[PDB]
Amino acid sequence: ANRTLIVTTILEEPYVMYRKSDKPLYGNDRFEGYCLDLLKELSNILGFIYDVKLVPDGKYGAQNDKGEWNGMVKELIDHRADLAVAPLTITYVREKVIDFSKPFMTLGISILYRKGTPIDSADDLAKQTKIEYGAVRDGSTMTFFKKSKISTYEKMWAFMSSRQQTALVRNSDEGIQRVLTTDYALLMESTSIEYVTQRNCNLTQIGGLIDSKGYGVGTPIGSPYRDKITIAILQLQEEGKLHMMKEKWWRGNGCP
Numbered sequence: 001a002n003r004t005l006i007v008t009t010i011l012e013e014p015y016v017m018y019r020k021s022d023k024p025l026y027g028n029d030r031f032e033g034y035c036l037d038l039l040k041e042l043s044n045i046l047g048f049i050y051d052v053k054l055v056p057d058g059k060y061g062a063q064n065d066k067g068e069w070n071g072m073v074k075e076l077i078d079h080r081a082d083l084a085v086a087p088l089t090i091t092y093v094r095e096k097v098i099d100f101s102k103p104f105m106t107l108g109i110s111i112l113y114r115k116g117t118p119i120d121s122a123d124d125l126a127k128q129t130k131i132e133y134g135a136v137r138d139g140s141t142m143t144f145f146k147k148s149k150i151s152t153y154e155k156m157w158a159f160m161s162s163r164q165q166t167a168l169v170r171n172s173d174e175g176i177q178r179v180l181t182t183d184y185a186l187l188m189e190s191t192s193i194e195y196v197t198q199r200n201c202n203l204t205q206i207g208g209l210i211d212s213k214g215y216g217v218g219t220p221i222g223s224p225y226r227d228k229i230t231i232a233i234l235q236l237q238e239e240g241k242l243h244m245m246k247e248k249w250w251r252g253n254g255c256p
């Protein structure tokens with residue numbers, strides 16, 4: 001039989017979440033979400049079973065000072081996993097080191113905060129000094145700021161980096177808790193903002209999207225699966241299945 005593919009992923013609502021049960025769940029049955037439905041579809045089309053493994057360091061992946069990678073990206077580079085199926089942002093810097101599928105969902109960076117301020121844009125946010133801000137550490141949002149040559153965003157990076165110990169959070173939940181309980185705004189992908197702001201009516205998006213990109217399935221460079229995964233994603237896109245999956249996991253219940 002075809003070797004069971006190792007899938008690296010990360011907990012992130014509503015892409016990958018622990019299933020709630022009153023009885024024991026083992027292996028892949030512990031997980032549900034958009035990316036799990038995507039895996040069920042892709043695996044049917046390509047003819048494999050898989051083993052879902054949460055990335056040990058709990059990171060999406062960025063480079064350090066020395067150019068060493070971490071997170072899911074490192075798992076692919078080091079051939080620890082066959083596929084990364086997660087909301088993994090397709091970027092120039094990553095595409096040089098792994099082979100991404102074509103995108104299955106689009107997004108852009110925006111701002112998550114509480115309601116009631118006159119802050120209306122990243123320009124406003126960088127200018128004012130009342131509210132701090134940051135991003136999840138070692139993801140594409142952090143890296144976007146780190147690499148930007150746009151003045152406002154260069155300033156924002158310098159700020160995040162200066163108070164990194166503090167401004168950069170471990171994961172979305174730490175970020176969201178910081179937004180709810182302190183004067184802090186989170187730079188966050190629009191897909192995730194849409195999800196949270198329809199569930200917690202104290203939260204809102206600030207401004208529009210500051211970039212435009214997509215999520216893809218990651219594979220190691222040279223992977224014999226990447227092109228087949230791309231073909232399967234296009235099939236699912238054309239058949240309307242990706243749209244249906246988004247509606248399934250983003251639906252309910254609502255805020256004004």
Ligand SMILES: CN[C@H]1[C@H]2O[C@@](C[C@H](N)C(=O)O)(C(=O)O)C[C@H]2OC[C@H]1O
Pocket residue numbers: 012060061087088089090136138139140141142171172187188189190192
């Ligand atoms: C899937 N989106 C969420 C997550 O996306 C990340 C990871 C990113 N999607 C990546 O592939 O590195 C980000 O950097 O915005 C980390 C975390 O941040 C909050 C929110 O944007």
